[model samples]
Target: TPRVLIANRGEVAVRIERAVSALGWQSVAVYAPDDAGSLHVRRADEAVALSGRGAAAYLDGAALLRVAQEHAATHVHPGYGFLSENADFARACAQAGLVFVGPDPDTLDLFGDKSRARGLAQRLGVPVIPGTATTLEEAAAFMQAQGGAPVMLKAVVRQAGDLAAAFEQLYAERLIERARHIEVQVAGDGQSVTHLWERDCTVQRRHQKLLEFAPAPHLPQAVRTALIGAALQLAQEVKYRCLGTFEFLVTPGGDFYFIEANPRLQVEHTVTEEWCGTDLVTAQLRLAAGETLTAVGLATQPADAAPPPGQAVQARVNMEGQVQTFTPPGGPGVRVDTFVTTGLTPSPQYDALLAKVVVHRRDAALPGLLRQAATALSEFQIAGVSTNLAFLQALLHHPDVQHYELSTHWLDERLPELVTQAAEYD
Candidate 1:
């Protein structure tokens, strides 16, 4: 029997625990002493206490490997953040004779760096933002070459102009103006790759996603088709093994550019799973254990043009205070993945996400789906902790959002007004 060690904490760790048991494998969850009482810890078949504090313990690859060895675990699943995309940890796990439940180490290295990954996309003829990965002199020249257009500076010295000095100043050091953040969910088994669908993660704050939905609403079918094809091309190029998300920036005009590929389970994966009706976490374990894409129950090729069946909208319920009352909504097509419950003070150390509330309705149009999602969010009985529940509802009810008018900067631009509006419901 296989014993899989979960090298993460909080909601994602709790999520992975279920998958491990679904495969009849023993689940070993790791936690900092302070996190010992977390739902993930209690649900695991066994648990280990880490010496380091907070997020540090979860990032210690060596310590994690030791625990795996001691527990006789055959695999280590790094849920998402922390060491999930760390090539060194993946390499270490392979050397230790334990399966790392993710992409190959070399693949990790390739997609982990923005510059390198963008270069690969360029070489492969995949569309990417026009920019250069280089020096002040080259950056300035590139800016001048663009006729001093408004190109970003602090990061990706793409094209530039007046902001050259600002870029230099920010390099103390540090960063597309209005493109929707769309991404395709793909699963690969070394030899084969398949695209699950694309997600609209345009609702974000400072590049942090707050809500996600799929398949992206109101997108032209042609653009959607091309976007998924691009993702599949990139994944197949690498013979990617494991689950990955190919992120892109799609402008309103339907021009899509590759951003980067995340070689691990994403926080918003629940929406994709709900839409596709596939167990992505389970697919990851099976693939890592040497199962083929077909064996893992994924189509070897893309689904024909008819589009996925339903719409799944997910809201990230983040905690801003101690939990006094925790009551998530329940109903058909409504699902919540969480670790926090009533009376538990969410740790100030880990991610602020308390739960992910998702609602899916296959028969309804996107507008009707949003209304259902808003109802689900409104029904939450959380108290004591300040949460984004009201904000999520406000967003879903926003006229622009309902009309499918969005951009990556949409949330940031409207945050002030929405924040004020959400306070009323609180």
Candidate 2:
């Protein structure tokens, strides 16, 4: 008897609607004028069009809350990005007498700010990447302190020699070369918390994760245990009452450092869901409804429970160009979550993700898993707009990927070669 408002679009929106309907709740889907043709709009029980256009429409909190009030929505699910991590929106939901399907506003604020989240993690005895979340003007000193060691500059403002102008954004961290990106998926009900597992998202291009898989490949058992324990400790301290991901960078020597934390459902949540045979979206709604982790069927589960004797991998089918003939691959252990279909050109205004092809194979390791995913990618027939499908297929075929030796910067280094290899298949 809940009215859930889906304040996002594309695959995640469609995903939330399906979960809402499955739980016997009414789903209210919102879309900008340009998104009238989106699949989420047609899938929901009620669809409302926002006045604004493009991404701004989805980010407008006032308009979103207005729609919720007009439709008598009992809960609002901000599926990642946009306003998902907005503390003000969460506060407004409570002010407006609506349940936000996430953690409390204070928790949102804690994770929304990098410095605060990092400080809290460090206070809780969690390992954090060495860096200074200081002012831009002060950043020059920190950079100099590094003694010219390799470092990465994030959240920076560009202008004249004036350091104050650049002070608008700051987060300079020492770059850990050849590091593997490992993240733990956690769920909490404000009292008890549990980890689903860890994901390996090292196959990325310019920091954009392209392929991801659960049960991080090649992670040492002791390191895995310690990583999950550290993540649990941090989430417990915060009393996080929602699904969140704690990301870290793992060096080749097995040392790990916390990167950051995402306070909402992630785009790659499907990989964990597929691996664990759990419905995360439904769990989120149940938790928001004041259900405990045990009552919601998450607490009693073993934190270090063995995976389901399989490897689950997800490949993002990004649109590089239009869709003429769209035919997604299918068979056993294959699931395609997408809003794109034949004849519909994916708008450039939003994420280019046309489909998320998730494949799980029982009793398969990295080699077999990569082959299964590669086969699925090869079978996908999407014409018109240029997609990274070929690139994904080529990456899966790489020896390093099959051997589970990918680093966070591997894709960026081999992109040109991969593109050339992909052309052969095209």
Candidate 3:
């Protein structure tokens, strides 16, 4: 068996380690100097340090590949962020004769292009929100032709430094209120694909998702079916493997537009796991081990076969530092996926997502599940950092949310008051 090198740190690193170990493979974890004592580093059979903190450990694809070769790793798992969606990294791993535990380079190239992916989806019968063009000028023309009021512009590729800047410019110009970031998980082999489900990530602050829920909480059945069907069609068209997420924006009147596709595991994979009852990390590993769709029994299965209906919600618990207004509550029906412990120190060098709290329930009880999750959140506890637990609780309790009358901009108009209330509580 070949050793697996996890080219990322934090909770996702820990996540990959479990999958590797379950497959009877040795795990090699890489980290920066700042993460020497992190859970990911400690859990691996061996650990390597990168030159700097932040994303360098995983983003330095060439360097990380070299480390994998040195450690005799046969496969490299880019867990979620860092280089998870980097095509160059996947190519580098392949060139080095190490299995890149995700989609092939061609699939990544095709689906990674946002505009192309959208076009592909449309061709495959996926209903997409009509858009003007890929460039700002094209967007302006589309808006002009449409008698513009509200619209969004998103990036085609991952690591959206430029996309963020563009969105900020749009906001500054008052071109739109705010953009809603939604994600859909798709899995496939070389020939067939399946849509796991959709997540509504509209409740975000500063581009980071604070709250997410599965089954999209009251999406019209027809629209949801079409969305998943389109996603599966695109995945099969491109021969995508492992796990991938397609992002979209839903307009006020329930129009959904394709944003982009992330060609790797996502932060909210846990929610899908809860709803689908399948371990995505395990699937990634199985795919890397040369298991084809036929071998895995997915080839004969229908693409849009709904996972047994279940409800799962995930809340991103973050380190707010002195902004101590939010705190987590604990109880039944709440599961926390975290790399932190009571005495652990949170490193400031990376994202402050402390944990993902997932709550599961049967389909018929989803509304009650949301309310229960909110009540549980209000009583949850996290020390040493601020979190959006309270805010999420409030959103859960909101009448529209309880009634399932949610739109992409539900948070935009209400976040200010929520933050103000949080400050007052502080």
Candidate 4:
């Protein structure tokens, strides 16, 4: 009778519960007073209430630990955010004999800081953008020497550069380097590391991603092979364990720069899961439970000669404004993962995300799959809260987006026009 505590709320919580029950294990979901009625709580085998409201309660480590101990949960899966990357929580879990379904704490420390990850990647022979340091004190002289510099500080630095670069790659406004946002999804058993493949999350808004392309359509095999190899190499360098993703910035000239190491599952993991046709959540759970790499699907590295199956696209249906209009989309190749739907008020207590609408090119050509996805998008009629559904549809209809010729800031630049275009449908 192994019970796992799902230390999270919202769609991710529901997702973890789905896996826990599928494996014949019990799931204990944590909820705040305001979230007691959430779908995760209802679906889980058991639920406990944490004091506090909004996002604050989920970060109460001690309180959460008490709930886990009281419920006799043998493991804790801190679903992305809310202590997901806290090494302290992870180490505490290990000491208390509870499994944390993520990489080891030390690995977490190194990758948690973007600067360290960059330095580590540089040492590991992975290409990374220059001029980024954790602190100005560390890289002030280095930065002052440059004109097109982005002054980064405790709060402004990280977001600014990510934004600047997003714009740079988009309209070549400020610093034009021409970059694409790419990341490789990898899993390790603390012994062997295997890369599932790469994803291009170039479509973004406020550094918040809008859509994702699995296997990153239109990528050259050489670039794909190199990206995967570097990711696996870095995983080995860290002697990685559990699940992690390596983020990189790829330029038109084929140079890839390291951005940061996301030490936890991301909002866009659905795309990765669809690409490999595997359940990543289940795989991570098994790995933490002492399962072998071979048991999961890694005898050797995946072959690069054969191309990936097909392109899989994901549209993040974020609950932004009123659902003045609403229509859920689905078909043979489409899969939507979330608790929110038409008429549901997206609670401000958590992330603004409402649903993850994923569609795959199953048994059909990528072009055919694209057509199906567009049709599905066209049918969505969410209103009350302003949503990106229309923006997502506009993206799909664009020829360049179909071919993956997108950058980090393209969505931001194109949104005004797209949002205007969406008005007609209303």
Cα lDDT listed for each candidate:
0.85, 0.86, 0.70, 0.76
2 against 4, candidate with superior lDDT: 2
What shift in Å separates residue 300 of candidate 1 from its native position after superposition? 1.7
Cα miss at 355, model 1 (Å)? 0.6
- The TM-score obtained by model 4 is 0.88
lDDT of 2 at 292: 89
Candidate order by TM-score, highest to lowest?
1, 2, 4, 3
Ranking by lDDT: 2, 1, 4, 3
**Per-residue lDDT of 246 in model 4:** 87
User: Residues 143-228, candidate 3, lDDT per residue (tens digit)?
Assistant: 55545354555432122234344454421111333334557788777666766667777666655677677867666666666566
Please provide, for model 1 over 1-426, each residue's C-alpha lDDT reduced to its tens digit, 9 standing for 90 to 100.
789999999989999999988888889999998787689989999999998898888898999999999999999999999999999999999899899999999889999977778888888888887666466776666567666455665434443444554675522111366688899988999988888878999888878898898888888888888888888888999999999999999988888899789999999989988988989999889999999999988877663456677788898988645678889999899999998867787778887888899899887488899899888888999888777788887888889889878888788888889988887666
Whole-model lDDT, model 2: 0.86
Query: Model 2, 1-426: lDDT tens per residue?
Result: 999999999999999999998899999999998777779989999999999889999999999999999999999999999999999999999999999989999989988888898898889888888777366545666656666665556763222244455455446777787899999989999988988889999999888988998878877778888788888888899888978999999988888998888889999999988888889889988988999888777854444655556779999998763467989999998999988767775676898888999999777578888889989988998778888888888998999998888788888888889999998768
Residue pairs in candidate 2 whose N, alpha carbon or C atoms collide under 3 angstroms: 320-386, 321-385, 321-386, 322-385
lDDT of 2 at 36: 76
Better of 1 and 2 by lDDT: 2
RMSD of candidate 3 to the truth, in angstroms, is 5.2
Candidate 2 lands at a TM-score of 0.94
- How far off is residue 393 in model 2, in Å? 0.9
